[PDB]
RNA sequence: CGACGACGUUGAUAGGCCGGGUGUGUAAGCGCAGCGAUGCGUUGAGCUAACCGGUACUAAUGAACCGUGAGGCUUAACCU
RNA sequence: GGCUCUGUUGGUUCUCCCGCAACGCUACUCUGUUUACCAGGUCAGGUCCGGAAGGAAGCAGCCAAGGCAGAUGACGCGUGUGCCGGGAUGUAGCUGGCAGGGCC
């Protein structure tokens, strides 16, 4: 009985999940857009975005904290020098999810997932 | 004057560097005064100037011709972006009846706007419209709205000065819901932000009818008071948009920028005239384009810019089409260079290990084959060349009939072109030394020719 | 699993975001004290899942598709 | 001290016609590009006939031309401008002057 229970198992044990979301988060932040399964990507929301909320306030504490979330310096320095300023005036909803066809091998539903400003800052550059 | 002042400023201060904050001083001052003469709210002017600074720090200006021109371009882009987007329209989707509330100062043209929107929604949107006058103050205002409604062919809800705005708009809303009206237009009395009773009145009305659309009607000639009016009206009511009137005048109309910045509400309408049939949609680029007068300076510049644009476009497209990969164009070039330079006798000598296995006389004559190939290629359109994968049987028929040969030969040359494309693709993917050393002579067994 | 329930922009259905509650128990940095471990001050600090209250920031699409066009015969009882 | 309506006259609005001057609207065409063979012209290359002389079917390119757009002159449909324009017409409506009564 699942009542009011949040989080999705995705057929992995605990630590495995945690890690997978760290690298998925890292990967997204780095490329600003990725293609993954639908449910993995609905769980990624709940990781990546709070990171962003973290970067919207700059201090040594938060740098460190997000490092402990993602374990990468490239990712954190990007987070605070780019995404922090970028989304500064927006409330939540930093990611957009777009469903597409099915992974040909296993027939899984796929979704691109991306930062909302992926487009306009890739055009203006 | 803008272009002249900016160009003069950027020329006299600095030579050709990459533009820096120190050079934008007099620029920002002249732009400031330009907006001050444009009747733009001073805080809006400053807050815009800040953005101009932010854009000035990273200037790519150095590579262009006229710095003032592209600076003008940046300012125009920022201003248009500040004006909002286009195709802004009231939400007539809404659950009928759609209630539109009017708000503004005295003599703002709210009533005429009600008439205009009445005719506009009636004729173009095929909507059933009911109009009502909440003004018990202004003499013959109700008669005016009734007259306009009679002219635009829109039903009018009777009202008098002996009644109260609340009961009036409530009875109007009730009548709109009972008769299944599509759109309910509510005209209200012009009021000042310093008036408490009138603000409480329009607040009680807005709370009563719960309009899906709340419009703010302000004159285009409005001065620095536009800031106070916009702020007060925005804080008093949740405006769904702003309606600018008397735009046809020679007025600068910076009040639009003022209200747009402060309220944050988009402008959905621009009154182009006094008459009811005259109305225009709000175009950010059009409004942000002109506060000025000039001549003969901008034409040549726009011409030169167009020339540079089309030149850079064509030159980049030419490299882009050739940069897609290997095609029948490069194949054609290599084939004509082949038939001109054809080395069959010499290439038989140049090759050593392939001649020891394959036959010595197996080399085909270059002239006939390559002339055939050239001529058959000459039967092909430019599209079938750059994009070889669209070639089908009927096109092969056209080609074969054009060159006066058999379709199988066309298929043969398409096969050879497929081989050449594959090979050159392998040359592009790997090294020429790894790929030249990866070339292998196929032998189906250690017996020769078997 | 089908199924039932809510919602699909005229929208609080989901996540986010803001506020609270809860839980843990005074973060990190800095300053002071001590030879040093550690302690004291900033400080009930910092973080906080599934909770509660708000907020259209992201996704809930304009459409299309299924479904039709007054509904058998007989008899009776009223009605022309 | 004001007003109304008759006699006469000056304007104005509406309906019809027209002049001068002063502001504003479609369909076609000129440029921008587009359309493989199956509308057309030139038709390279190649190919067909001939010893030769030369002709021929016709691909591509180009030009019409056919799609889609950026605006050029005349036709078609309108007008709170001025000459209080010139007229026709109302048994009309509105307004003013004058000769005035009468009502307060
Ligand atoms: N030129 C022009 N005049 C306008 C516009 N809107 C209103 N007016 C003028 O405003 C005058 C009356 O304004 P009104 O509607 O009565 O003011 P409100 O009822 O308080 O909003 C009219 O004589 C119009 O000529 C417009 O968009 N353009
Ligand atoms: F003149 Al108004 F409302 F008609 F102030
Ligand atoms: Mg009014």
mmCIF file of N, CA and C in Angstrom, chain B residues 48-166:
data_model
loop_
_atom_site.group_PDB
_atom_site.id
_atom_site.type_symbol
_atom_site.label_atom_id
_atom_site.label_comp_id
_atom_site.label_asym_id
_atom_site.label_seq_id
_atom_site.Cartn_x
_atom_site.Cartn_y
_atom_site.Cartn_z
ATOM 1 N N UNK B 48 15.804 51.646 -17.491
ATOM 2 C CA UNK B 48 16.115 51.272 -18.866
ATOM 3 C C UNK B 48 17.594 51.527 -19.148
ATOM 4 N N UNK B 49 18.079 52.673 -18.679
ATOM 5 C CA UNK B 49 19.480 53.058 -18.810
ATOM 6 C C UNK B 49 20.399 51.993 -18.221
ATOM 7 N N UNK B 50 19.987 51.407 -17.102
ATOM 8 C CA UNK B 50 20.748 50.329 -16.480
ATOM 9 C C UNK B 50 20.923 49.140 -17.425
ATOM 10 N N UNK B 51 19.831 48.752 -18.078
ATOM 11 C CA UNK B 51 19.864 47.668 -19.053
ATOM 12 C C UNK B 51 20.759 48.039 -20.231
ATOM 13 N N UNK B 52 20.690 49.304 -20.640
ATOM 14 C CA UNK B 52 21.538 49.806 -21.716
ATOM 15 C C UNK B 52 23.012 49.679 -21.331
ATOM 16 N N UNK B 53 23.311 49.907 -20.054
ATOM 17 C CA UNK B 53 24.662 49.734 -19.529
ATOM 18 C C UNK B 53 25.079 48.271 -19.613
ATOM 19 N N UNK B 54 24.200 47.398 -19.123
ATOM 20 C CA UNK B 54 24.447 45.959 -19.131
ATOM 21 C C UNK B 54 24.732 45.452 -20.542
ATOM 22 N N UNK B 55 24.075 46.052 -21.529
ATOM 23 C CA UNK B 55 24.322 45.707 -22.924
ATOM 24 C C UNK B 55 25.557 46.417 -23.478
ATOM 25 N N UNK B 56 25.951 47.510 -22.829
ATOM 26 C CA UNK B 56 27.085 48.308 -23.288
ATOM 27 C C UNK B 56 28.412 47.691 -22.876
ATOM 28 N N UNK B 57 28.404 46.975 -21.757
ATOM 29 C CA UNK B 57 29.616 46.334 -21.252
ATOM 30 C C UNK B 57 30.177 45.307 -22.241
ATOM 31 N N UNK B 58 29.285 44.566 -22.893
ATOM 32 C CA UNK B 58 29.679 43.470 -23.766
ATOM 33 C C UNK B 58 29.636 43.751 -25.259
ATOM 34 N N UNK B 59 29.729 45.025 -25.635
ATOM 35 C CA UNK B 59 29.586 45.446 -27.030
ATOM 36 C C UNK B 59 30.494 44.712 -28.021
ATOM 37 N N UNK B 60 29.883 44.211 -29.091
ATOM 38 C CA UNK B 60 30.596 43.624 -30.223
ATOM 39 C C UNK B 60 30.805 44.668 -31.321
ATOM 40 N N UNK B 61 30.477 45.914 -30.989
ATOM 41 C CA UNK B 61 30.420 47.037 -31.925
ATOM 42 C C UNK B 61 31.604 47.166 -32.893
ATOM 43 N N UNK B 62 32.810 46.901 -32.400
ATOM 44 C CA UNK B 62 34.046 47.164 -33.145
ATOM 45 C C UNK B 62 34.095 46.632 -34.582
ATOM 46 N N UNK B 63 33.436 45.506 -34.833
ATOM 47 C CA UNK B 63 33.538 44.840 -36.128
ATOM 48 C C UNK B 63 32.638 45.441 -37.210
ATOM 49 N N UNK B 64 31.701 46.295 -36.811
ATOM 50 C CA UNK B 64 30.751 46.868 -37.760
ATOM 51 C C UNK B 64 31.246 48.189 -38.344
ATOM 52 N N UNK B 65 30.375 48.855 -39.096
ATOM 53 C CA UNK B 65 30.705 50.135 -39.713
ATOM 54 C C UNK B 65 30.360 51.303 -38.795
ATOM 55 N N UNK B 66 29.066 51.541 -38.607
ATOM 56 C CA UNK B 66 28.600 52.635 -37.762
ATOM 57 C C UNK B 66 28.167 52.131 -36.389
ATOM 58 N N UNK B 67 28.892 52.546 -35.339
ATOM 59 C CA UNK B 67 28.605 52.148 -33.956
ATOM 60 C C UNK B 67 27.257 52.670 -33.465
ATOM 61 N N UNK B 68 26.929 53.903 -33.839
ATOM 62 C CA UNK B 68 25.680 54.519 -33.436
ATOM 63 C C UNK B 68 24.474 53.794 -33.998
ATOM 64 N N UNK B 69 24.616 53.270 -35.211
ATOM 65 C CA UNK B 69 23.529 52.550 -35.866
ATOM 66 C C UNK B 69 23.187 51.258 -35.135
ATOM 67 N N UNK B 70 24.203 50.447 -34.855
ATOM 68 C CA UNK B 70 23.989 49.178 -34.170
ATOM 69 C C UNK B 70 23.617 49.394 -32.707
ATOM 70 N N UNK B 71 24.087 50.493 -32.124
ATOM 71 C CA UNK B 71 23.682 50.845 -30.768
ATOM 72 C C UNK B 71 22.192 51.172 -30.768
ATOM 73 N N UNK B 72 21.766 51.915 -31.786
ATOM 74 C CA UNK B 72 20.355 52.210 -31.996
ATOM 75 C C UNK B 72 19.575 50.909 -32.156
ATOM 76 N N UNK B 73 20.169 49.952 -32.864
ATOM 77 C CA UNK B 73 19.558 48.640 -33.047
ATOM 78 C C UNK B 73 19.356 47.926 -31.711
ATOM 79 N N UNK B 74 20.370 47.987 -30.853
ATOM 80 C CA UNK B 74 20.303 47.362 -29.535
ATOM 81 C C UNK B 74 19.224 48.011 -28.671
ATOM 82 N N UNK B 75 19.215 49.342 -28.652
ATOM 83 C CA UNK B 75 18.218 50.095 -27.894
ATOM 84 C C UNK B 75 16.804 49.773 -28.376
ATOM 85 N N UNK B 76 16.638 49.693 -29.693
ATOM 86 C CA UNK B 76 15.347 49.369 -30.289
ATOM 87 C C UNK B 76 14.903 47.958 -29.926
ATOM 88 N N UNK B 77 15.837 47.012 -29.964
ATOM 89 C CA UNK B 77 15.535 45.632 -29.600
ATOM 90 C C UNK B 77 15.105 45.521 -28.141
ATOM 91 N N UNK B 78 15.843 46.194 -27.263
ATOM 92 C CA UNK B 78 15.529 46.191 -25.839
ATOM 93 C C UNK B 78 14.179 46.849 -25.569
ATOM 94 N N UNK B 79 13.892 47.921 -26.300
ATOM 95 C CA UNK B 79 12.650 48.662 -26.121
ATOM 96 C C UNK B 79 11.453 47.843 -26.594
ATOM 97 N N UNK B 80 11.602 47.192 -27.744
ATOM 98 C CA UNK B 80 10.565 46.314 -28.277
ATOM 99 C C UNK B 80 10.323 45.144 -27.329
ATOM 100 N N UNK B 81 11.408 44.589 -26.799
ATOM 101 C CA UNK B 81 11.316 43.500 -25.833
ATOM 102 C C UNK B 81 10.632 43.967 -24.550
ATOM 103 N N UNK B 82 10.778 45.251 -24.239
ATOM 104 C CA UNK B 82 10.151 45.831 -23.058
ATOM 105 C C UNK B 82 8.671 46.116 -23.295
ATOM 106 N N UNK B 83 8.309 46.358 -24.551
ATOM 107 C CA UNK B 83 6.927 46.664 -24.909
ATOM 108 C C UNK B 83 6.042 45.421 -24.887
ATOM 109 N N UNK B 84 6.668 44.249 -24.828
ATOM 110 C CA UNK B 84 5.934 42.996 -24.827
ATOM 111 C C UNK B 84 5.852 42.366 -26.204
ATOM 112 N N UNK B 85 4.904 41.448 -26.371
ATOM 113 C CA UNK B 85 4.745 40.732 -27.634
ATOM 114 C C UNK B 85 3.576 41.276 -28.450
ATOM 115 N N UNK B 86 3.327 40.654 -29.598
ATOM 116 C CA UNK B 86 2.239 41.066 -30.477
ATOM 117 C C UNK B 86 1.043 40.129 -30.353
ATOM 118 N N UNK B 87 0.008 40.402 -31.144
ATOM 119 C CA UNK B 87 -1.211 39.595 -31.167
ATOM 120 C C UNK B 87 -1.848 39.431 -29.791
ATOM 121 N N UNK B 88 -1.742 40.471 -28.968
ATOM 122 C CA UNK B 88 -2.349 40.463 -27.643
ATOM 123 C C UNK B 88 -3.846 40.728 -27.751
ATOM 124 N N UNK B 89 -4.650 39.808 -27.229
ATOM 125 C CA UNK B 89 -6.097 39.893 -27.381
ATOM 126 C C UNK B 89 -6.817 39.539 -26.081
ATOM 127 N N UNK B 90 -8.000 40.116 -25.889
ATOM 128 C CA UNK B 90 -8.847 39.793 -24.746
ATOM 129 C C UNK B 90 -9.270 38.330 -24.809
ATOM 130 N N UNK B 91 -9.566 37.739 -23.657
ATOM 131 C CA UNK B 91 -9.919 36.327 -23.622
ATOM 132 C C UNK B 91 -11.425 36.119 -23.720
ATOM 133 N N UNK B 92 -11.845 35.926 -24.982
ATOM 134 C CA UNK B 92 -13.221 35.658 -25.352
ATOM 135 C C UNK B 92 -13.513 34.174 -25.295
ATOM 136 N N UNK B 93 -12.474 33.361 -25.131
ATOM 137 C CA UNK B 93 -12.733 31.996 -24.738
ATOM 138 C C UNK B 93 -13.714 31.980 -23.579
ATOM 139 N N UNK B 94 -13.527 32.884 -22.615
ATOM 140 C CA UNK B 94 -14.092 32.815 -21.279
ATOM 141 C C UNK B 94 -15.526 32.242 -21.239
ATOM 142 N N UNK B 95 -15.887 31.740 -20.073
ATOM 143 C CA UNK B 95 -17.247 31.293 -19.872
ATOM 144 C C UNK B 95 -18.199 32.464 -20.028
ATOM 145 N N UNK B 96 -19.089 32.453 -21.017
ATOM 146 C CA UNK B 96 -19.904 33.626 -21.299
ATOM 147 C C UNK B 96 -20.854 33.905 -20.150
ATOM 148 N N UNK B 97 -21.227 35.171 -19.925
ATOM 149 C CA UNK B 97 -20.755 36.340 -20.678
ATOM 150 C C UNK B 97 -19.356 36.798 -20.271
ATOM 151 N N UNK B 98 -18.596 37.314 -21.231
ATOM 152 C CA UNK B 98 -17.282 37.873 -20.947
ATOM 153 C C UNK B 98 -17.420 39.314 -20.471
ATOM 154 N N UNK B 99 -16.928 39.587 -19.267
ATOM 155 C CA UNK B 99 -17.065 40.910 -18.672
ATOM 156 C C UNK B 99 -15.791 41.734 -18.826
ATOM 157 N N UNK B 100 -15.915 42.889 -19.471
ATOM 158 C CA UNK B 100 -14.780 43.786 -19.660
ATOM 159 C C UNK B 100 -14.988 45.090 -18.896
ATOM 160 N N UNK B 101 -14.117 45.343 -17.924
ATOM 161 C CA UNK B 101 -14.228 46.533 -17.086
ATOM 162 C C UNK B 101 -13.265 47.623 -17.542
ATOM 163 N N UNK B 102 -13.743 48.864 -17.551
ATOM 164 C CA UNK B 102 -12.926 49.997 -17.968
ATOM 165 C C UNK B 102 -12.484 50.834 -16.773
ATOM 166 N N UNK B 103 -11.253 51.332 -16.829
ATOM 167 C CA UNK B 103 -10.707 52.156 -15.757
ATOM 168 C C UNK B 103 -9.743 53.199 -16.315
ATOM 169 N N UNK B 104 -9.708 54.367 -15.679
ATOM 170 C CA UNK B 104 -8.838 55.443 -16.111
ATOM 171 C C UNK B 104 -9.239 56.786 -15.534
ATOM 172 N N UNK B 105 -8.562 57.841 -15.976
ATOM 173 C CA UNK B 105 -8.851 59.190 -15.502
ATOM 174 C C UNK B 105 -9.972 59.830 -16.314
ATOM 175 N N UNK B 106 -10.213 61.115 -16.073
ATOM 176 C CA UNK B 106 -11.263 61.840 -16.777
ATOM 177 C C UNK B 106 -10.835 62.207 -18.195
ATOM 178 N N UNK B 107 -11.740 62.005 -19.149
ATOM 179 C CA UNK B 107 -11.466 62.314 -20.540
ATOM 180 C C UNK B 107 -10.424 61.400 -21.150
ATOM 181 N N UNK B 108 -10.360 60.169 -20.652
ATOM 182 C CA UNK B 108 -9.394 59.189 -21.139
ATOM 183 C C UNK B 108 -9.867 58.527 -22.429
ATOM 184 N N UNK B 109 -11.157 58.651 -22.724
ATOM 185 C CA UNK B 109 -11.722 58.048 -23.917
ATOM 186 C C UNK B 109 -12.176 56.617 -23.699
ATOM 187 N N UNK B 110 -12.529 56.297 -22.458
ATOM 188 C CA UNK B 110 -12.990 54.961 -22.095
ATOM 189 C C UNK B 110 -14.274 54.581 -22.826
ATOM 190 N N UNK B 111 -15.203 55.527 -22.923
ATOM 191 C CA UNK B 111 -16.493 55.287 -23.566
ATOM 192 C C UNK B 111 -16.336 55.009 -25.059
ATOM 193 N N UNK B 112 -15.557 55.855 -25.726
ATOM 194 C CA UNK B 112 -15.265 55.674 -27.141
ATOM 195 C C UNK B 112 -14.573 54.334 -27.358
ATOM 196 N N UNK B 113 -13.745 53.942 -26.395
ATOM 197 C CA UNK B 113 -13.091 52.639 -26.430
ATOM 198 C C UNK B 113 -14.113 51.513 -26.309
ATOM 199 N N UNK B 114 -15.146 51.735 -25.501
ATOM 200 C CA UNK B 114 -16.220 50.761 -25.346
ATOM 201 C C UNK B 114 -16.978 50.603 -26.660
ATOM 202 N N UNK B 115 -17.202 51.718 -27.349
ATOM 203 C CA UNK B 115 -17.845 51.681 -28.651
ATOM 204 C C UNK B 115 -17.006 50.942 -29.679
ATOM 205 N N UNK B 116 -15.720 51.278 -29.727
ATOM 206 C CA UNK B 116 -14.780 50.646 -30.648
ATOM 207 C C UNK B 116 -14.701 49.141 -30.435
ATOM 208 N N UNK B 117 -14.526 48.731 -29.181
ATOM 209 C CA UNK B 117 -14.444 47.315 -28.846
ATOM 210 C C UNK B 117 -15.780 46.627 -29.090
ATOM 211 N N UNK B 118 -16.861 47.391 -28.980
ATOM 212 C CA UNK B 118 -18.189 46.878 -29.260
ATOM 213 C C UNK B 118 -18.334 46.505 -30.722
ATOM 214 N N UNK B 119 -18.034 47.457 -31.601
ATOM 215 C CA UNK B 119 -18.098 47.217 -33.040
ATOM 216 C C UNK B 119 -17.114 46.130 -33.464
ATOM 217 N N UNK B 120 -15.922 46.171 -32.879
ATOM 218 C CA UNK B 120 -14.857 45.227 -33.199
ATOM 219 C C UNK B 120 -15.231 43.794 -32.835
ATOM 220 N N UNK B 121 -15.756 43.606 -31.628
ATOM 221 C CA UNK B 121 -16.144 42.274 -31.173
ATOM 222 C C UNK B 121 -17.415 41.795 -31.864
ATOM 223 N N UNK B 122 -18.296 42.728 -32.212
ATOM 224 C CA UNK B 122 -19.537 42.369 -32.888
ATOM 225 C C UNK B 122 -19.292 41.906 -34.320
ATOM 226 N N UNK B 123 -18.603 42.734 -35.101
ATOM 227 C CA UNK B 123 -18.379 42.440 -36.513
ATOM 228 C C UNK B 123 -17.371 41.315 -36.745
ATOM 229 N N UNK B 124 -16.185 41.450 -36.161
ATOM 230 C CA UNK B 124 -15.086 40.530 -36.442
ATOM 231 C C UNK B 124 -15.196 39.203 -35.694
ATOM 232 N N UNK B 125 -15.562 39.264 -34.418
ATOM 233 C CA UNK B 125 -15.597 38.068 -33.583
ATOM 234 C C UNK B 125 -16.979 37.421 -33.536
ATOM 235 N N UNK B 126 -17.946 38.045 -34.206
ATOM 236 C CA UNK B 126 -19.320 37.545 -34.261
ATOM 237 C C UNK B 126 -19.897 37.316 -32.865
ATOM 238 N N UNK B 127 -19.654 38.264 -31.968
ATOM 239 C CA UNK B 127 -20.086 38.146 -30.580
ATOM 240 C C UNK B 127 -21.324 38.986 -30.293
ATOM 241 N N UNK B 128 -22.168 38.492 -29.392
ATOM 242 C CA UNK B 128 -23.340 39.240 -28.953
ATOM 243 C C UNK B 128 -22.954 40.101 -27.755
ATOM 244 N N UNK B 129 -23.009 41.417 -27.936
ATOM 245 C CA UNK B 129 -22.457 42.344 -26.955
ATOM 246 C C UNK B 129 -23.527 43.193 -26.272
ATOM 247 N N UNK B 130 -23.402 43.335 -24.954
ATOM 248 C CA UNK B 130 -24.267 44.219 -24.184
ATOM 249 C C UNK B 130 -23.431 45.266 -23.455
ATOM 250 N N UNK B 131 -23.760 46.537 -23.666
ATOM 251 C CA UNK B 131 -23.008 47.625 -23.055
ATOM 252 C C UNK B 131 -23.835 48.345 -21.995
ATOM 253 N N UNK B 132 -23.153 48.892 -20.994
ATOM 254 C CA UNK B 132 -23.825 49.579 -19.900
ATOM 255 C C UNK B 132 -22.967 50.735 -19.382
ATOM 256 N N UNK B 133 -23.621 51.804 -18.938
ATOM 257 C CA UNK B 133 -22.919 52.968 -18.412
ATOM 258 C C UNK B 133 -23.020 53.037 -16.893
ATOM 259 N N UNK B 134 -21.874 52.961 -16.228
ATOM 260 C CA UNK B 134 -21.823 53.029 -14.771
ATOM 261 C C UNK B 134 -21.592 54.459 -14.295
ATOM 262 N N UNK B 135 -21.587 55.401 -15.233
ATOM 263 C CA UNK B 135 -21.305 56.794 -14.911
ATOM 264 C C UNK B 135 -22.591 57.560 -14.619
ATOM 265 N N UNK B 136 -22.782 57.914 -13.351
ATOM 266 C CA UNK B 136 -23.901 58.754 -12.939
ATOM 267 C C UNK B 136 -23.472 60.208 -12.768
ATOM 268 N N UNK B 137 -22.183 60.469 -12.967
ATOM 269 C CA UNK B 137 -21.615 61.783 -12.688
ATOM 270 C C UNK B 137 -21.624 62.688 -13.914
ATOM 271 N N UNK B 138 -20.848 62.310 -14.924
ATOM 272 C CA UNK B 138 -20.710 63.110 -16.135
ATOM 273 C C UNK B 138 -22.031 63.257 -16.883
ATOM 274 N N UNK B 139 -22.416 64.506 -17.185
ATOM 275 C CA UNK B 139 -23.649 64.812 -17.917
ATOM 276 C C UNK B 139 -23.664 64.206 -19.318
ATOM 277 N N UNK B 140 -24.768 63.547 -19.664
ATOM 278 C CA UNK B 140 -24.974 62.967 -20.992
ATOM 279 C C UNK B 140 -23.894 61.956 -21.376
ATOM 280 N N UNK B 141 -23.313 61.295 -20.382
ATOM 281 C CA UNK B 141 -22.345 60.234 -20.640
ATOM 282 C C UNK B 141 -23.071 58.949 -21.024
ATOM 283 N N UNK B 142 -24.165 58.677 -20.319
ATOM 284 C CA UNK B 142 -25.005 57.522 -20.602
ATOM 285 C C UNK B 142 -25.638 57.654 -21.982
ATOM 286 N N UNK B 143 -26.073 58.868 -22.310
ATOM 287 C CA UNK B 143 -26.645 59.153 -23.619
ATOM 288 C C UNK B 143 -25.585 59.024 -24.707
ATOM 289 N N UNK B 144 -24.346 59.358 -24.361
ATOM 290 C CA UNK B 144 -23.229 59.237 -25.289
ATOM 291 C C UNK B 144 -22.942 57.773 -25.604
ATOM 292 N N UNK B 145 -22.833 56.961 -24.558
ATOM 293 C CA UNK B 145 -22.591 55.532 -24.725
ATOM 294 C C UNK B 145 -23.751 54.865 -25.458
ATOM 295 N N UNK B 146 -24.966 55.330 -25.182
ATOM 296 C CA UNK B 146 -26.156 54.820 -25.851
ATOM 297 C C UNK B 146 -26.130 55.164 -27.336
ATOM 298 N N UNK B 147 -25.681 56.377 -27.644
ATOM 299 C CA UNK B 147 -25.573 56.831 -29.025
ATOM 300 C C UNK B 147 -24.537 56.008 -29.783
ATOM 301 N N UNK B 148 -23.363 55.843 -29.180
ATOM 302 C CA UNK B 148 -22.298 55.048 -29.781
ATOM 303 C C UNK B 148 -22.742 53.605 -29.996
ATOM 304 N N UNK B 149 -23.448 53.056 -29.011
ATOM 305 C CA UNK B 149 -23.960 51.694 -29.094
ATOM 306 C C UNK B 149 -25.001 51.568 -30.199
ATOM 307 N N UNK B 150 -25.775 52.629 -30.397
ATOM 308 C CA UNK B 150 -26.788 52.652 -31.444
ATOM 309 C C UNK B 150 -26.124 52.747 -32.814
ATOM 310 N N UNK B 151 -24.970 53.404 -32.862
ATOM 311 C CA UNK B 151 -24.230 53.565 -34.108
ATOM 312 C C UNK B 151 -23.502 52.285 -34.506
ATOM 313 N N UNK B 152 -22.954 51.580 -33.520
ATOM 314 C CA UNK B 152 -22.200 50.359 -33.791
ATOM 315 C C UNK B 152 -23.106 49.132 -33.845
ATOM 316 N N UNK B 153 -24.399 49.340 -33.615
ATOM 317 C CA UNK B 153 -25.368 48.261 -33.674
ATOM 318 C C UNK B 153 -25.255 47.286 -32.517
ATOM 319 N N UNK B 154 -24.920 47.806 -31.341
ATOM 320 C CA UNK B 154 -24.800 46.985 -30.141
ATOM 321 C C UNK B 154 -25.876 47.360 -29.126
ATOM 322 N N UNK B 155 -26.550 46.350 -28.581
ATOM 323 C CA UNK B 155 -27.609 46.561 -27.599
ATOM 324 C C UNK B 155 -27.096 47.307 -26.369
ATOM 325 N N UNK B 156 -27.909 48.229 -25.863
ATOM 326 C CA UNK B 156 -27.521 49.049 -24.722
ATOM 327 C C UNK B 156 -28.432 48.816 -23.521
ATOM 328 N N UNK B 157 -27.831 48.730 -22.338
ATOM 329 C CA UNK B 157 -28.588 48.558 -21.104
ATOM 330 C C UNK B 157 -28.901 49.916 -20.480
ATOM 331 N N UNK B 158 -30.199 50.242 -20.366
ATOM 332 C CA UNK B 158 -30.669 51.531 -19.841
ATOM 333 C C UNK B 158 -30.187 51.812 -18.419
ATOM 334 N N UNK B 159 -29.731 53.037 -18.182
ATOM 335 C CA UNK B 159 -29.284 53.455 -16.859
ATOM 336 C C UNK B 159 -29.473 54.959 -16.679
ATOM 337 N N UNK B 160 -29.566 55.401 -15.430
ATOM 338 C CA UNK B 160 -29.768 56.815 -15.138
ATOM 339 C C UNK B 160 -28.885 57.286 -13.985
ATOM 340 N N UNK B 161 -28.800 58.602 -13.812
ATOM 341 C CA UNK B 161 -27.955 59.194 -12.781
ATOM 342 C C UNK B 161 -28.553 59.035 -11.385
ATOM 343 N N UNK B 162 -29.820 58.635 -11.326
ATOM 344 C CA UNK B 162 -30.496 58.443 -10.057
ATOM 345 C C UNK B 162 -30.178 57.102 -9.423
ATOM 346 N N UNK B 163 -29.509 56.240 -10.179
ATOM 347 C CA UNK B 163 -29.150 54.912 -9.698
ATOM 348 C C UNK B 163 -27.730 54.883 -9.139
ATOM 349 N N UNK B 164 -27.260 53.688 -8.801
ATOM 350 C CA UNK B 164 -25.907 53.512 -8.288
ATOM 351 C C UNK B 164 -25.141 52.512 -9.150
ATOM 352 N N UNK B 165 -23.842 52.774 -9.374
ATOM 353 C CA UNK B 165 -22.973 51.962 -10.235
ATOM 354 C C UNK B 165 -23.020 50.467 -9.922
ATOM 355 N N UNK B 166 -23.056 50.122 -8.638
ATOM 356 C CA UNK B 166 -23.086 48.725 -8.216
ATOM 357 C C UNK B 166 -24.348 48.021 -8.711
#
